[PDB]
Amino acid sequence: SIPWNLERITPDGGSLVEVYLLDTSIQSDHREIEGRVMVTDFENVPEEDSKCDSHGTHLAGVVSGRDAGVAKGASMRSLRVLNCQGKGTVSGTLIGLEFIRKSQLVQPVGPLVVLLPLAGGYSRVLNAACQRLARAGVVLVTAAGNFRDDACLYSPASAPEVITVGATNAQDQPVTLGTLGTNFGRCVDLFAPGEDIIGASSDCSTCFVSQSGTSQAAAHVAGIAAMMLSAEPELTLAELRQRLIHFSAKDVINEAWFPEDQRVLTPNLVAALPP
Amino acid sequence: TATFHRCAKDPWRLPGTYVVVLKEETHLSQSERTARRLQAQAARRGYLTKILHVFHGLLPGFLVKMSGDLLELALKLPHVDYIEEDSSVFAQ
Numbered sequence A: 001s002i003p004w005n006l007e008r009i010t011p012d013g014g015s016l017v018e019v020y021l022l023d024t025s026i027q028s029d030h031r032e033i034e035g036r037v038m039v040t041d042f043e044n045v046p047e048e049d050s051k052c053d054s055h056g057t058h059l060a061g062v063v064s065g066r067d068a069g070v071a072k073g074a075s076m077r078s079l080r081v082l083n084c085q086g087k088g089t090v091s092g093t094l095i096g097l098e099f100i101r102k103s104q105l106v107q108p109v110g111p112l113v114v115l116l117p118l119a120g121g122y123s124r125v126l127n128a129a130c131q132r133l134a135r136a137g138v139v140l141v142t143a144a145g146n147f148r149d150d151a152c153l154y155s156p157a158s159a160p161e162v163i164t165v166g167a168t169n170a171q172d173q174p175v176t177l178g179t180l181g182t183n184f185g186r187c188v189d190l191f192a193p194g195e196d197i198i199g200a201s202s203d204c205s206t207c208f209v210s211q212s213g214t215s216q217a218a219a220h221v222a223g224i225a226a227m228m229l230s231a232e233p234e235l236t237l238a239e240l241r242q243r244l245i246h247f248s249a250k251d252v253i254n255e256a257w258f259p260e261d262q263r264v265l266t267p268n269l270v271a272a273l274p275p
Numbered sequence B: 001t002a003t004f005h006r007c008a009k010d011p012w013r014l015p016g017t018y019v020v021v022l023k024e025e026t027h028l029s030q031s032e033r034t035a036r037r038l039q040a041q042a043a044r045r046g047y048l049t050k051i052l053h054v055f056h057g058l059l060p061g062f063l064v065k066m067s068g069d070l071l072e073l074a075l076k077l078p079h080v081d082y083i084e085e086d087s088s089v090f091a092q
Helices: A004-009 A054-064 A090-106 A124-135 A214-231 A237-247 B028-044 B068-074
Strands: A018-023 A037-043 A075-080 A087-089 A112-116 A118-121 A139-143 A163-168 A190-193 A197-200 A208-211 B003-005 B013-022 B050-055 B061-065 B080-091
Touching (some): A004 A190, A018 A054, A018 A090, A018 A214, A054 A197, A075 A090, A090 A112, A090 B013, A090 B050, A090 B061, A090 B080, A124 B013, A124 B080, A139 A214, A163 A214, B068 B080
Parallel strands (some): A018 A075, A018 A112, A037 A075, A112 A139, A139 A163, A163 A190, B003 B080
Antiparallel strands (some): A118 B080, A197 A208, B013 B061, B050 B061
């Protein structure tokens, strides 16, 4: 018996890639991710209006966790841009993206994947900073957003240079999240498993919890990208995108879940690892 | 040609903090001079400002905590491409 999402993407890899995570604080000594995530000194969070590290700990586990991770050989570096309530700022995220590029210039390693499991409204400056970091050779993966809306109205989802990931469930259908659900439209690059994802729970050192969202879906694509770049390190961003589409399951999403005008614009692709 | 932008989702706006984005290829030294220049011009008008951060590496510019009353003046600073009011992002 394996978590459904790990079976869905399979038709210790990712060791050549470092995955940066801009999220809440992380419980770095949880058994699922201990020794796999290096916590940077970076913190830039707004004041608030076991739970502080819930979101980031689960996502670190989805990417590289011992028992339930996608790219179990990848190393991760974490930056805290979301406060205890999961809220951050565009400026804090900009400073974090600049910190990643500064860190890379000071001590270069192999291919870098940056996971942005967050969203705000369309931001010219956040899209420009993502565009610049992607043009600099870094791979960015972001959540499409959980607003049951057009991803082009949110950032970094609307940045064309970022790999924007929507969420699908075990029936390969778009995830519902309360009254809302995955975003869609022409700014989404592909979908990935984002419902009932088993992953590290920060409640205890061996606890696991299932979570749903486009952040979980984006973490799956960050893990798949880490595996793909480790196997073929010379891939450009355009080639990595070609591979993600190529190895994806095609036309399995029932496009009737999307609004009528978004059906031809939304890619009908569910991510998967190469065989 | 310098423009002002703020989040279209009004509850997510964070007024009082602005990201001043300078033209591509503006150097760190030029961004620091532009930030000092805004602080001097605002102080002559009786306004207190704070330069929270100076950007370089991806985008040239700076993060400033100031009254939005200073935006018309800030858009006339040398090297300015655009200014964006800070806004919230959320865990997905």
